[PDB]
Amino acid sequence: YWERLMLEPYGSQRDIAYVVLCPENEALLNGAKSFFRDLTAIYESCRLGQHRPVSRLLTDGIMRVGSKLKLYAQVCRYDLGPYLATMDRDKVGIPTDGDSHYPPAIVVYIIDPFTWTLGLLRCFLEMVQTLPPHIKSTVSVQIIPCQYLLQPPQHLKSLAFSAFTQCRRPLPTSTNVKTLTGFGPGLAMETALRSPDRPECIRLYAPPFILAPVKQKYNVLFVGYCLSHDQRWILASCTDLYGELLETCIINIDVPSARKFGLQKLWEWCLGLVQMSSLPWRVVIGRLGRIGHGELKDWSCLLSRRNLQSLSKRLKDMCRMCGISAADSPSILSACLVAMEPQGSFVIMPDSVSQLNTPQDTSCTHILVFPTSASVQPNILQQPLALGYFVSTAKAGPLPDWFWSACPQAQYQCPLFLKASLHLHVPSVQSSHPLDSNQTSDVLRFVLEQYNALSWLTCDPATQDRRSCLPIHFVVLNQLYNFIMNML
Amino acid sequence: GLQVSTKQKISPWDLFEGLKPSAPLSWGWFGTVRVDRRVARGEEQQRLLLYHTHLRPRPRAYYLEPL
Amino acid sequence: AFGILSYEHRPLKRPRLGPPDVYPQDPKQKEDELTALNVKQGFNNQPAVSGDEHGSAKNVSFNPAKISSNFSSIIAEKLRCNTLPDTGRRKPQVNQKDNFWLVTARSQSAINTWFTDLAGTKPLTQLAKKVPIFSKKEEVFGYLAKYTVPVMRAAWLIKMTCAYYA
Amino acid sequence: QTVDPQSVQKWVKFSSLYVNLILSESVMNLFKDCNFDSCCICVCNMNIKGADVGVYIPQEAQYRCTCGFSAVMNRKFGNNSGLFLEDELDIIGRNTDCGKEAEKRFEALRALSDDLILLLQDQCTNLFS
Amino acid sequence: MAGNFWQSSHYLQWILDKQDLLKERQKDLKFLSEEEYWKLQIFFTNVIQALGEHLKLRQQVIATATVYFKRFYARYSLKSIDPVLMAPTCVFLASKVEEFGVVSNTRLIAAATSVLKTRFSYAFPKEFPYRMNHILECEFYLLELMDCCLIVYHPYRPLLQYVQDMGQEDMLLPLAWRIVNDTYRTDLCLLYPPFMIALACLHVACVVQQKDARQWFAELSVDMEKILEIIRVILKLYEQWKNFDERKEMATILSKMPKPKP
Amino acid sequence: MDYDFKVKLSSERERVEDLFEYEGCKVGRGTYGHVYKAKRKDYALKQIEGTGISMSACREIALLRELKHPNVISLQKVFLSHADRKVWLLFDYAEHDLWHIIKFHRLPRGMVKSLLYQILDGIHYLHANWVLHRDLKPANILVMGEGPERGRVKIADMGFARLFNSPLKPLADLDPVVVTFWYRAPELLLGARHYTKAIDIWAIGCIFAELLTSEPIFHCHDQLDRIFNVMGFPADMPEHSTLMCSLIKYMEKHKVKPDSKAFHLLQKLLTMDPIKRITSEQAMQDPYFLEDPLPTSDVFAGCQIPYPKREFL
Numbered sequence A: 001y002w003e004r005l006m007l008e009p010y011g012s013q014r015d016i017a018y019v020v021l022c023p024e025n026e027a028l029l030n031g032a033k034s035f036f037r038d039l040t041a042i043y044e045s046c047r048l049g050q051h052r053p054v055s056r057l058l059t060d061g062i063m064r065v066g067s068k069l070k071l072y073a074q075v076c077r078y079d080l081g082p083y084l085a086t087m088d089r090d091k092v093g094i095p096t097d098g099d100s101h102y103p104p105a106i107v108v109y110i111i112d113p114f115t116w117t118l119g120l121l122r123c124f125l126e127m128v129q130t131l132p133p134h135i136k137s138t139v140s141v142q143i144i145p146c147q148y149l150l151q152p153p154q155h156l157k158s159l160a161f162s163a164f165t166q167c168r169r170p171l172p173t174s175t176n177v178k179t180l181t182g183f184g185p186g187l188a189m190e191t192a193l194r195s196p197d198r199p200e201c202i203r204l205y206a207p208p209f210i211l212a213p214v215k216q217k218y219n220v221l222f223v224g225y226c227l228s229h230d231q232r233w234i235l236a237s238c239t240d241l242y243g244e245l246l247e248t249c250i251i252n253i254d255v256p257s258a259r260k261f262g263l264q265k266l267w268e269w270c271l272g273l274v275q276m277s278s279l280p281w282r283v284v285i286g287r288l289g290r291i292g293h294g295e296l297k298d299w300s301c302l303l304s305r306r307n308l309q310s311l312s313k314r315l316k317d318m319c320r321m322c323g324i325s326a327a328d329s330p331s332i333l334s335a336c337l338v339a340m341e342p343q344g345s346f347v348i349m350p351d352s353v354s355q356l357n358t359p360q361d362t363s364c365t366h367i368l369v370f371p372t373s374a375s376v377q378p379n380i381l382q383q384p385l386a387l388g389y390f391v392s393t394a395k396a397g398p399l400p401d402w403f404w405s406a407c408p409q410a411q412y413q414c415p416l417f418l419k420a421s422l423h424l425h426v427p428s429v430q431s432s433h434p435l436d437s438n439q440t441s442d443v444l445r446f447v448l449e450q451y452n453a454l455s456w457l458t459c460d461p462a463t464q465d466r467r468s469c470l471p472i473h474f475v476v477l478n479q480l481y482n483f484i485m486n487m488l
Numbered sequence B: 001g002l003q004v005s006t007k008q009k010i011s012p013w014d015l016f017e018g019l020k021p022s023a024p025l026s027w028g029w030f031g032t033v034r035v036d037r038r039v040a041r042g043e044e045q046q047r048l049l050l051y052h053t054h055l056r057p058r059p060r061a062y063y064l065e066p067l
Numbered sequence C: 001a002f003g004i005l006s007y008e009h010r011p012l013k014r015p016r017l018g019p020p021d022v023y024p025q026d027p028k029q030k031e032d033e034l035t036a037l038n039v040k041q042g043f044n045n046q047p048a049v050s051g052d053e054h055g056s057a058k059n060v061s062f063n064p065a066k067i068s069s070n071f072s073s074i075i076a077e078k079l080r081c082n083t084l085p086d087t088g089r090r091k092p093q094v095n096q097k098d099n100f101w102l103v104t105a106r107s108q109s110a111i112n113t114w115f116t117d118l119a120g121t122k123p124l125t126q127l128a129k130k131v132p133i134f135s136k137k138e139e140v141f142g143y144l145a146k147y148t149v150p151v152m153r154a155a156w157l158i159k160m161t162c163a164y165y166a
Numbered sequence D: 001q002t003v004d005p006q007s008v009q010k011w012v013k014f015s016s017l018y019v020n021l022i023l024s025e026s027v028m029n030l031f032k033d034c035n036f037d038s039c040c041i042c043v044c045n046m047n048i049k050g051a052d053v054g055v056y057i058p059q060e061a062q063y064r065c066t067c068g069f070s071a072v073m074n075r076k077f078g079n080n081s082g083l084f085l086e087d088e089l090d091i092i093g094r095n096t097d098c099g100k101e102a103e104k105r106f107e108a109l110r111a112l113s114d115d116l117i118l119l120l121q122d123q124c125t126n127l128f129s
Numbered sequence E: 001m002a003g004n005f006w007q008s009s010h011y012l013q014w015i016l017d018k019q020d021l022l023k024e025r026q027k028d029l030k031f032l033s034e035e036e037y038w039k040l041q042i043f044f045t046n047v048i049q050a051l052g053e054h055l056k057l058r059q060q061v062i063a064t065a066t067v068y069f070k071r072f073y074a075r076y077s078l079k080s081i082d083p084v085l086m087a088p089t090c091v092f093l094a095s096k097v098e099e100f101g102v103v104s105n106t107r108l109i110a111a112a113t114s115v116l117k118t119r120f121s122y123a124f125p126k127e128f129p130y131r132m133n134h135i136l137e138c139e140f141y142l143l144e145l146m147d148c149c150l151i152v153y154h155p156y157r158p159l160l161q162y163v164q165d166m167g168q169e170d171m172l173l174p175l176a177w178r179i180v181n182d183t184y185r186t187d188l189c190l191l192y193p194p195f196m197i198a199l200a201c202l203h204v205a206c207v208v209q210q211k212d213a214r215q216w217f218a219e220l221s222v223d224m225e226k227i228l229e230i231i232r233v234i235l236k237l238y239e240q241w242k243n244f245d246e247r248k249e250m251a252t253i254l255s256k257m258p259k260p261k262p
Numbered sequence F: 001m002d003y004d005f006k007v008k009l010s011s012e013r014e015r016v017e018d019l020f021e022y023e024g025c026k027v028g029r030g031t032y033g034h035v036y037k038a039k040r041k042d043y044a045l046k047q048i049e050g051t052g053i054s055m056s057a058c059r060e061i062a063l064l065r066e067l068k069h070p071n072v073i074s075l076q077k078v079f080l081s082h083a084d085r086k087v088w089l090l091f092d093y094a095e096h097d098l099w100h101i102i103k104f105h106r107l108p109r110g111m112v113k114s115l116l117y118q119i120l121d122g123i124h125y126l127h128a129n130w131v132l133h134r135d136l137k138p139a140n141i142l143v144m145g146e147g148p149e150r151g152r153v154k155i156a157d158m159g160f161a162r163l164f165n166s167p168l169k170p171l172a173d174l175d176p177v178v179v180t181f182w183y184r185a186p187e188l189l190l191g192a193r194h195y196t197k198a199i200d201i202w203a204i205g206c207i208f209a210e211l212l213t214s215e216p217i218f219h220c221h222d223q224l225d226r227i228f229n230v231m232g233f234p235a236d237m238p239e240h241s242t243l244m245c246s247l248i249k250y251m252e253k254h255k256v257k258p259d260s261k262a263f264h265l266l267q268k269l270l271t272m273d274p275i276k277r278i279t280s281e282q283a284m285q286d287p288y289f290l291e292d293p294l295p296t297s298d299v300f301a302g303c304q305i306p307y308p309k310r311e312f313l
């Protein structure tokens, strides 16, 4: 009921100007005009901003074209390349407000007649190089199949939210202080903003919604990774405690040592994210599949007590500001490694019992964690430190095939059983949060509880319940894995 | 904590956006709470970073290179 | 200056006050009136606090625990106030004396502007203040087809017309 | 679930006791706790072989594996699951049999620009695919 | 400019984060601890207040002079310019800009010397060895390097507006006024907008005198977390001022004062 | 106050004579200071009279630091020299001064219409920020020419401008004379010590009449006699007795129709009392601007400028 209750998202309703590439077929041209006219209405009915086309009026802002992909590329580059490169009757009554004190994002909608795609994406590669830097910094591409227009709405709401989330408004490059004097605090901010070490294209991320806060200041980074269908690439994804940030990375490991270098690059990527903030962090690392026997050895070296402490001191040397106040230095207070895999031994049937029927119209999730000691009554202790079951009624997305290889029978049952294990649990590096408790059972129930909470960010606004099970970071990583698999 | 209790049926003819409030829908069904605006957490951290000058991150192409 | 938040466009205590620290031009202030004595003796400015305005007292006792308890009570009460209390199910109701016109046939030119505005992009809230109702329920479909109104907005007018007839 | 593909097709077109005694000590003798399925290198000796698995799987003298590792069940879950090729080959064994099959399969699975890949990972970053 | 704070220069540039204040005060902290620096700031604010009171000045001009004083030291070292000369030149500039009239040369010199010899003799055993040319060059430098931001907003107008809105004007106004006067000792003027400080002072005043103000504060819509921080800062001020004596210590602290080189 | 701080400031500072060719080619002389044409090694560089900073310089700096408007002048940078202790300001160059237009014609109606509209909106914006100009002269109104923006009159030279948000002292206790006697309002000419914001309305009305007749309406007790002569004597504040029809004929003598839309606005702009004088916002609501052709952002509206460029002294 987003439109009925007239709610508004985060990011202040980013405005979008669009260009559409359509073939000169009357059947496909007429459908394009109506589809995007409907898209503008649903985009603006939700408080997502303005979805008007590029301000120049050329037949409803639709650009036409004309084996045939070559014809689809010549006009694609020759036209859109350069393209992106005193009476006031009503104004007499009101005086001008004054000078007082964010360009609209450009989205290029691509219709795909083919029932390869890279042939269509090759425009975007060619256009960006032949563009001025300021225009190129905010330009996005969206590909819609042609079968949507002709053949059979929840698609429009999904497309409107997807376009808004992909905008990623850039950080401003100027402060407009207007010092008009030799030097002052305004100039100090300006000359610090243009320092060479500051990265470019910050591209702040603003989603339609985030998790509500629940009662020092810190943050938790949730990172998960898995290898592709070939071991050439490591795919990783990350998210914040409240889903405020969401980024992904691809690391090339292709040698014809091979994995220790790959894991070092991953740890550098995770360190690059925490060090861009100004508050202490907590790191929880996840693995989509089953953890290896060498990855545990390699991770124990990187996530050692001596190491995590060493980078705290190295940070102090570089930055003066971190030296005075320790509450502002982006150090690491704890580390954790958790692996998720199916069980395939237990089954629960919701039909058997002992107002609402849970599996039909609702999603539920139960957890149970225990210390799982090896016997009753140096760097690495016992293999599973603590274990926990993850019973969820909501369906899980399409996982990689090797995920279900051990117990393929459990793939199809509606209530999924998943197993979460603890492997490292490095507590209180700098020297009460659950992640700093020496009881390994408390750590899992905190990590699994946040795994459930992050799974609710997957609720499609066009759908009643969450589209897929598990954390949001796991879900995007899985989407990236299949995208690489399909097109390559 | 925050569980689910009941389900309500409403005819699709009562759901229109002309009226400013929600006539068939009640805000108490969803446990709505109005909280005042604040600056985004991500935006603020960018501002506080200007006083730090940490190491420059990799160009995002350093990862996709032969080992 | 993106990190800092500005309350310029957010009124504080709206029923009795506007913007927090923005001062509009009041037409009945003390800097515009001209009494007989004001012109002769000039502007008469008296200290805001009688006695010693400069003097600041710190010898009076303060109880931080009581202040903290009162502030906690205020914030807890404030949270309760902003909770949007639940209301029972009820049919939507609209005031017919203002929200539309009873007879559409007053002028054909006004209809063309309104339906051209329906096919436009302005929000439905603005159109909610004035909607057309025809004598019969069949001609609205014919007029909608002429302007090619998107089906999402065309179904909204049907809901409003049914609301009037109910 | 077939009606939708079919109608989509349409829209597209128009518009002996000794033998069984030994077996019971190898096949059914393995009855281990299922909680320890998620296990790794043996902590006692820093190896992938330990406990009493030295008699079930084909020297070195491991001493008193007190923990719960079992290499018989380690090979079950660590053969096709997502693992580094370096880690997987240690579990199976390059010199022994079935090591060549894994290497041959991996190569047969395989048989462009850098900026194209960066564009690809940007499209999948959003919440919705 | 007045009536629009959110577009003025005092808010666009001269609102600083606490991290910047902590970072820029390290050079002054290499010789004195945080407590000594805080006590020195309080003492010099008191000196500015006394000097303004001697010249028969109003309260807005003294507040503007105090704000000018704090702004200069916030981003520059304390040993750059002698604060004993910072105070009179800031007072003179504040009087000049607030349309109160330019003080006389001998008048200002005599007032400064008399104040220093009657109520601050222990801190400064010697006389005030400066002339008007030094004051003129110092104020010229201050106007040069302060980005020419001479308009300073104050919580007094929001405080009067809020107390008039509430209705009570005799039981609450003196306490709120004296709390606003006392809060200038801290750095809150550089940290938060004036209306938040006014709201915090009003809350303290109404809580102290046992007035039911819960219903008034309930309806207003503003961030309710920063006000708690302002209350905490004010309470810390009042608690630390309880066991602090000027005469017993300021001699020792100014004995440790880093003086500028000739 | 040590040597290292001074040398660091000197290193950070930049010399005005080392960046601009301000020497020679003086373009304006007045009591406010000297205005020169300058360019980087075109802007108007203004040097203020008097060693050090005076009340006028302090008011100028403290007012144009925070005021921004298309119809209000805006300084780009300020220079402060310590060798001679004087102040230098750098405004954007304004080629044409309204005094030059008046002198050259001694005239499209849309031009004066738009010029009046722009000055009224500018003074309304100035009054919105709670400040009084206290000086409105035809020499203080400047017009851009043949640049990125055409027309776009700019109000400047507000050295006498003072904030009236809250007066700690009466406005006449520190400034007996606020504006030249050619445009002094009757209220302050009668010895008023607390005057409202309506004086600028009287000034803009007077200059609007001046442009209407292309001749100063008030020309020279020195001006009180002329004030009583132009529009009669009030027969319907201090020294009331110590002082010891005409408007229609005066406007007729200048070939201006008594019955028109401009005449009513001019008559209602000038009153003997402050209460009945119209404020800035109501001036725009007058249908005088709405009648016939409407006001233009570009005063010239494509016409060639016959007025020559400002000459050197």
Ligand SMILES: [Zn+2]
Pocket: A318, A319, A320, A321, A322, A329, B051, B052, B053, B054
């Ligand atoms: Zn740092």
Ligand SMILES: [Zn+2]
Pocket: D042, D043, D044, D045, D050, D051, D064, D065, D066, D067, D068, D069
């Ligand atoms: Zn073992």
